[PDB]
């Protein structure tokens, strides 16, 4: 159960940072009628090379090869995610000043609240992104109090 997968989290968080010295921000498992899919978001550096995923997956799989208190075998999903992150905290927005983010704010336009812009600078609640919508350039201050949903976005 959840307690069990947490126990696996502590036991296998050792390797991750004695192997690739990564840290798992979490391990979560999804299942659809088969060995469930334990997505372990491995961190360390942000721009994780694919090799830095292959070798890390080798390490973690070998670690759990002899370690599986959970009776059945399961899919290890070794994830080395990028910077893309849901922006709940203000620091989440502060780190992302480099990269574009998209937010859903209490005042939408055209029915839906979700809009993507590319941050130029950090200004507390106010936003000076080069938000680009409909091929339109502008720095639009999106009030965070309006923001019902906010996530850091892909850079493309």
């Amino acid at each position: 159960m959840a307690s069990k997968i947490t126990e696996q989290v502590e036991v296998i968080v050792k390797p991750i940072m004695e192997d690739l010295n990564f840290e798992l921000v979490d391990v979560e498992y999804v299942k659809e009628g088969r060995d469930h899919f334990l997505r372990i978001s491995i961190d360390k550096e942000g721009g994780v090379d694919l090799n830095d995923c292959t070798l890390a997956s080798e390490k973690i799989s070998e670690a759990m090869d002899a370690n599986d208190p959970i009776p059945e075998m399961y899919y290890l999903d070794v994830a080395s995610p990028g910077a893309e992150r849901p922006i709940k905290k203000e620091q989440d927005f502060q780190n992302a000043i480099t990269k574009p983010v998209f937010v859903s704010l209490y005042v939408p336009i055209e029915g839906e609240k979700e809009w993507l812009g590319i941050l130029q600078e950090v200004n507390n609640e106010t936003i000076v992104v080069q938000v680009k919508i409909k091929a339109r350039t502008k720095d639009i201050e999106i009030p965070r109090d309006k923001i019902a949903k906010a996530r850091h976005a892909v850079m493309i």
């Binding site: 942000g46 090379d49 694919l50 995923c53 799989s61 290890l76 893309e84 850079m155 493309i156």
Partner: protein, 135 residues
């Protein structure tokens, strides 16, 4: 069926749906108009890369990555092939292909011409694998 009911009916076929949702650029970059472009290729980036593990006995560790093409539509896609030099948020070309590794995915990257560079040590990449004739 009877001739009359045959007449007042089309006898419709069982026409399929393309299991490859290959909606290429079409009108994505104006008006965001959905357009069934059948392009064999769009340019686009894999914002994240990953690696799910296969089960035993063939522990053939397969690696995935989530990608956005010219239409920028989310999908987790596996990488085939040996050797690469790309990373997170690298531009990649993905071809349509469903393999025995994992469900939830029906496409595949191609090697040789973009950030996921192929290897020119073999001779099979003489006309393919993105790499030139091994000379």
């Amino acid at each position: 069926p009877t001739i009359n009911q045959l007449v007042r009916k089309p006898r419709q076929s069982k026409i399929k749906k393309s299991d490859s949702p290959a909606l290429n650029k079409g009108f994505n970059s104006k008006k965001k108009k959905f357009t069934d472009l059948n392009s064999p290729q769009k340019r686009g980036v894999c914002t994240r890369v990953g690696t799910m593990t296969p089960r035993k006995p063939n522990s053939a560790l397969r690696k995935y990555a989530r990608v956005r093409l010219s239409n920028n539509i989310e999908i987790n896609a596996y990488i085939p092939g040996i050797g690469h030099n790309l990373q997170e948020h690298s531009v990649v070309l993905v071809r349509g292909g469903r393999v025995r590794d994992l469900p939830g995915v029906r496409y595949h990257i191609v090697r040789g011409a973009l950030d996921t560079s192929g290897v020119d040590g073999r001779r099979q990449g003489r006309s393919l694998y993105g790499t030139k004739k091994p000379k």
